[PDB]
Amino acid sequence: AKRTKKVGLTGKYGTRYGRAARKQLLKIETSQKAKYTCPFCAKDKVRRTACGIWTCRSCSKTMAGGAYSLHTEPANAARATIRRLRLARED
Amino acid sequence: TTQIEKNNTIVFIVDRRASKPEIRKAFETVFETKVARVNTLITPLGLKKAFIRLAPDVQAMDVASKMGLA
């Protein structure tokens, strides 16, 4: 049976720190606890080990990524643009 | 005296700057005998004491008697 209605994993904080901070942390902490898909392993086993460091627990690659998620939107866009600029440098 | 009569060991005061090899050599050359092992300590007054065990085929009674130690 469901145990809380809204607070989710922020129920560890009790009544402290106010509503806006707890609302921000629910999102942040869910993101940083999630399992991600290993871009090499093929499997969903990547977990965070430090702020920007992600390890695949199956194939054991280590990767550099975001603070609280494996990929970031700026990096997605930058990688796409750099790939396009390379391809334009191939005649 | 118990130490000499059994355990075949004799007790001296020596110069504080003397090590175990020097002590063994000096006892051998002076008393014309055979040392086996040497223990040492410095007393609370600053003297050096040597426990000298002679060879298992020598009588400390006899060497100490020739000394005058009895």
């Binding site: - | 410095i42 609370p44 007054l45 600053g46």
Partner: protein, 50 residues
């Protein structure tokens, strides 16, 4: 302390060695009336800093 350097051991040893009274034959020989050696010390009320 049970873990002391030889230099501190030797200076302590000299204090112990010299903490003594005037011999009686010395008193007779030198014709003394003062018979207490006032450079003696006792461990309970001393502050040897050696």
């Amino acid at each position: 302390t049970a873990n002391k350097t030889l230099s501190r051991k030797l200076r302590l040893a000299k204090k112990t060695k010299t903490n003594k009274n005037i011999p009686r034959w010395v008193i007779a020989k030198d014709h003394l009336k003062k018979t207490w050696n006032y450079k003696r010390h006792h461990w309970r009320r001393s502050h040897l800093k050696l």
